[PDB]
């Protein structure tokens, strides 16, 4: 009897002919963890699917690309019922034969059942609630799900082959739950902090940075234009450079009245690009917001104010437009990255030499016993470190401002238009740390036990790393990969305890 | 602490989920504990409307019908 109820509390009887102890009724309830039914994971669900995801920049923020075939199988009952509701099929069987035949008329029946009918999209690491979002389906040839770029951040979804799952909201309450709660457009803000999670990601923000930027002398410098309309007319036709300092008449709005939009017009000192971009900015936002260089931080604060001022609808439609225009102008820019785009300081080799004398100095002090071994070590490590800072802030100065150009005079100097700098400055991708590894020397790596090798990597990636330098680089990589691969699981555990306690 | 505080939950179906099942079932079965649902974990197990969000209207309307004329 004991073995039947709960096995393992006495002898652990073993099943017939099989060494493994037979599972008893208590073991049927139990598991990992607690119950199997609802624990991760947790029941399979009908009307569902999944596949590789791709980009789809054409989408509006409220929709997503859905493969024709996926949609056919998903909505099969909807298709069957609509087919004989309109009388295209005698009976359900004949309808089945119709979609099984894929008769041409059925695709149109599917456009009816899809139109207003959100589908749920999900990704692997469902962490916060933004992990599931509703979209309006758009029928797409091909087997890949297309996902609006602006959402890729909330999902933490790359395009490197990540797959996403689709779910159909069958019941009416679910359709309306999807549209009014989980819809893409209705959650634009992170629940962790009110900052917008729809912030433009990389190509788009590089577009706006290249758009609103100004060089010192460019075609059309000094002229004046009536309004953004004729600014674009000037640019697209090839008369004026995208970035040139120009005064143009603009009309801004301020809602500073009591629920009422004030208007004011003036001659603003600006560039051509910022002028064109103004066409997108809705209503009550001031022109002050676009007159700057528009980095990734500012371009977010743009959206936030737009939300806190005009409300939701204007912010959404605003967001869509920024993406479309960001991608578009960035493509025109022809930004690229060459090998001659990474500029090594001319003084690098000299800094290394100077930093190299200190180490041979401290060594001489240790040979004569003037300084202890540990004190020696710390010294050498410090000078090399100081050297790294020196080279970094060397290549940073050279790289940043070195564009030296002429307006009507001899010279002047502005922020460089060099490709890789624009990337790092705008906030798109790359950072001062990583740039430092490209051009200036990269670091002093660390041996597995946690100590730091006193002979740094004097080279960088634009130059070659020799055998040793690479090998020393390896430990750092391996601890990185290992830490993330284990620490990924750990994060989940924390949320678990938390949601259980709340 | 969080892991300790999550231990106490009135509803036993919730507790049989994340705690040790055997112990929860016994220790509850002797006292004849009557689980009223009212929680999230338990309503999900049994498969009805969550007592929050869209469901909050439901549970509210039922909770008042209960222990009432």
């Amino acid at each position: 009897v004991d073995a039947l109820l709960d096995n393992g509390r006495r002898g652990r009887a073993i099943t017939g002919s099989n060494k493994r102890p037979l599972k008893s009724l208590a073991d049927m309830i139990k598991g990992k963890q607690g119950r199997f039914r609802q624990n991760l994971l947790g029941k399979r669900v009908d009307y569902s699917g999944r596949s590789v995801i791709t980009v789809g920049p054409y989408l509006r923020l409220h929709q997503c690309g859905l493969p024709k075939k996926m949609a056919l199988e998903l909505f099969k009952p909807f298709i069957y019922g609509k087919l004989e509701l309109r009388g295209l099929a005698t009976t359900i069987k004949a309808a089945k034969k119709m979609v099984e035949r894929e008769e041409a008329v059925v695709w149109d029946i599917l456009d009816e059942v899809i139109r207003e009918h959100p589908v749920l999209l999900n990704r692997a690491p469902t962490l916060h609630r933004l992990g599931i979002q509703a979209f309006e389906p758009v029928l797409i040839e091909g087997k890949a799900i297309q996902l609006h770029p602006l959402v890729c951040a909330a999902y933490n979804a790359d395009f490197d082959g990540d797959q996403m799952a689709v779910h159909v909201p069958l019941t009416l309450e679910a359709q309306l739950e999807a549209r009014a709660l989980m819809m893409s457009t209705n959650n634009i803000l992170s629940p962790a902090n009110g900052e917008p999670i729809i912030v433009p990601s990389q190509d788009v923000v590089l577009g706006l940075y290249y758009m609103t930027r100004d060089c010192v002398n460019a075609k059309g410098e000094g002229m004046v234009l009536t309004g953004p309309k004729e600014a674009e007319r000037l640019y697209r036709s090839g008369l004026a450079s995208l970035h040139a300092r120009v005064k143009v008449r603009i009309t801004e709005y301020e809602k500073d009245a009591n629920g009422e939009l004030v208007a004011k017009t003036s001659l603003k000192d600006t560039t051509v690009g910022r002028a064109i971009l103004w066409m997108i900015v809705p209503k009550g936002l001031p022109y002050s917001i676009v007159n700057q260089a528009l980095g990734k931080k500012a371009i977010s604060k743009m959206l936030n104010t737009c939300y806190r001022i005009l409300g939701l609808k204007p912010t959404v439609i605003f967001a869509d437009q920024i993406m479309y225009t960001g991608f578009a102008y960035a493509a025109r820019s022809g930004a690229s990255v060459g090998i001659d785009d990474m500029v090594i300081p001319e003084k690098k080799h000299e800094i290394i030499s100077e930093a190299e004398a200190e180490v041979a100095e401290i060594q001489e002090q240790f040979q004569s016993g003037l300084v202890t071994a540990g004190e020696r070590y710390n010294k050498v490590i410090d000078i090399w470190a100081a050297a790294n800072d020196r080279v970094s802030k060397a290549m940073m100065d050279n790289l940043q401002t070195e564009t030296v150009i002429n307006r009507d005079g001899q010279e002047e100097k502005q922020v460089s238009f060099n490709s890789i700098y624009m990337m790092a400055d705008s906030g798109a991708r790359g950072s001062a740390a990583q740039i430092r590894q490209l051009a200036g020397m990269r670091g002093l790596m660390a041996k597995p036990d946690g100590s730091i090798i006193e002979t740094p990597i004097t080279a960088n990636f634009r130059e070659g790393l020799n055998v040793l330098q690479y090998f020393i680089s390896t430990h750092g990589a391996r601890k990185g990969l290992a830490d993330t691969a284990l620490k990924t699981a750990n994060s989940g555990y924390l949320t678990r305890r938390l949601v259980d306690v709340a | 602490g969080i892991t300790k505080a999550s231990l106490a939950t009135e509803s036993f179906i919730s507790a049989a989920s994340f705690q040790e099942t055997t112990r929860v079932l016994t220790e509850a079965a002797v006292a004849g504990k009557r689980d009223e649902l009212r929680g999230l974990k338990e309503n999900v197990i049994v498969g009805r409307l969550i007592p929050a969000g869209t469901g909050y209207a439901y549970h509210q309307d039922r909770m008042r019908r209960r222990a009432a004329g």
């Binding site: 620490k487 924390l494 | 969080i2």
Partner: peptide
């Protein structure tokens, strides 16, 4: 100390190793 495990310790209330007294 610090890091993600530091957070878990905080929410777990664990009394530190060499605590002070009030």
């Amino acid at each position: 100390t610090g890091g993600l495990p530091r957070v878990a310790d905080l929410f777990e209330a664990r009394r530190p190793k060499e605590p002070a007294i009030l």
